Amino acid sequence: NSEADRQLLEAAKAGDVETVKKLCTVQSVNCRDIEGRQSTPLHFAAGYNRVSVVEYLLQHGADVHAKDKGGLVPLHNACSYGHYEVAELLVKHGAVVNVADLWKFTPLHEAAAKGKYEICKLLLQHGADPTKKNRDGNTPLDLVKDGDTDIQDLLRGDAAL
């Protein structure tokens, strides 16, 4: 869409905090990317582990609950790619850990399917429900790869590491 919105989205993806500070206004902090899956700057900064941009955006009114075209919130993006510090920052600023996208995948589904034990533990310690089923009838435990035995034990209810 607009020129300064595309550059803000790109600066968020790239971790270019200085350009974010120069282009970020109240009108643009939650702007959606028309030429993609309609992610906001916080989606990009969260998915690409741009901790300094994530901190800046949240402080300047970025919507921690913003949904992209598929129903993902920034906590989904961070949990999918193992960005523990970003995920902990989003939860600290009110991210709903049991939110589900259009296929009813929660962040715990993402973390369990990608093998992120510490992310799974983080979400469970903030109230994530391991019994939620997605559209395919699968719980987060049902998505755990064979070989991630510590996650299977964790989602079973064993003591965390």
Add this chain to the structure above:
Amino acid sequence: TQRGEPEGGS
């Protein structure tokens, strides 16, 4: 359609 992947990278 089919479910995509989130924006991001490791």
